[PDB]
């Protein structure tokens, strides 16, 4: 189980979008199985994976879910601040042609 995560961790790291989609799904499967601390890590990495796929909605959903339980996790705060920059630049680009 602690190695089924390492696989998904490497997968959510990969340069190929398909390895990333596979990495999330393995993390979504490992999520109810997990412990308190394990779920906090899995959720963080699900936000990382969803962000690397421009799925910024779902990525913000996780990182805020974690930030409600851990308001002072600075790495979660930094990941939420990176999701906000991508979304506001993306929203600017969308409406550039009016």
Backbone φ, ψ for residue 54 (5° rounding): 55, 10
- When asked if residue 73 is in the footprint of its own copies (CB under 8 A), the reply is no
Question: Which residue from 39, 13, 11, 38 is spatially nearest to 25, judged by alpha carbons?
Answer: 11
Nearer to its own copies, 26 or 66 (CB): 26
7 part of the interface to its own copies, by CB under 8 A: yes
Does the footprint of its own copies cover residue 16 (CB under 8 A)? yes
Per CB under 8 A, does 6 bind its own copies? yes
Positions that interact with its own copies (CB under 8 A): 3, 6-7, 10-11, 13-16, 19
């Amino acid at each position: 189980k602690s190695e089924q995560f390492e696989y998904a961790w490497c997968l959510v790291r990969s340069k190929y979008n398909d390895d990333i989609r596979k990495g999330i799904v393995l993390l979504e499967e490992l999520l109810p199985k997990g412990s308190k601390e394990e779920q906090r890590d899995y959720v963080f990495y699900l936000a990382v994976g969803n962000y690397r796929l421009k799925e910024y909605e779902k990525a913000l959903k996780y990182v805020r879910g974690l930030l409600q339980t851990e308001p002072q996790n600075n790495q979660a705060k930094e990941l939420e601040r990176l999701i906000d920059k991508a979304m506001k630049k993306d929203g600017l680009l969308e409406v550039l042609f009016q």
